[PDB]
Amino acid sequence: SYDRAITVFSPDGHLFQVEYAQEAVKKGSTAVGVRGRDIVVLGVEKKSVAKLQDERTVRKICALDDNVCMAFAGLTADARIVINRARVECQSHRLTVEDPVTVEYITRYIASLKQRYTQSNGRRPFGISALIVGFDFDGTPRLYQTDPSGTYHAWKANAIGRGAKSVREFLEKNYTDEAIETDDLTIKLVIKALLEVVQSGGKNIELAVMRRDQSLKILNPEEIEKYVAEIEKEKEENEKKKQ
């Protein structure tokens, strides 16, 4: 087969292919994750809403198993490959261990797949970053992030894709014990974080929530619009308080 070394060190000790894959990730639409007390929320910038597109077919939020879901930023096709591998692994874990995967377990699997693709002949790195959210069997909510280099971390809230820096700075200023006391406020924090970057309104936003013991639930545009209206009411009322 083809066995060229694609990812190699450069004089300064940098892997240029991994860095370029991370540039590709930075080109993707922004994805935001928030880890609530009884809910984990994923939101994604549905950039360039085409009235003719069938939105069901281009969803960047997906389910890996009953208790783990994933959003991503970067090359969509690479993401599809990784997601399929992760789904197969989740079913294998059920088969061999007779229990569901922890969020950390499948996160480790995906990160290991990515790292392998940064150190094997004839392959380029995956050009995607992933937010993996879920609930462990014991009920703990979990939010993890993986990047092309194969490193991963756990987060309280995080953002990836274009404008992830501004969104992360906003989440730093807004992630509090009060702000995630209820599912509504967690969802509204995600919506506000996306609104700090998204072009306009909740039309360009896809939101999914996972509650303890339940499967992935996609918020329909009516629910998102109601939440955005509540956010605008809160903004107006608080600005009037300020004035």
Partner: peptide, 13 residues
């Protein structure tokens, strides 16, 4: 002589 078809470019393309 290898064209390097499946590699990223410096801008992630």
């Amino acid at each position: 002589y290898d064209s390097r078809t499946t590699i990223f470019s410096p801008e992630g393309r």
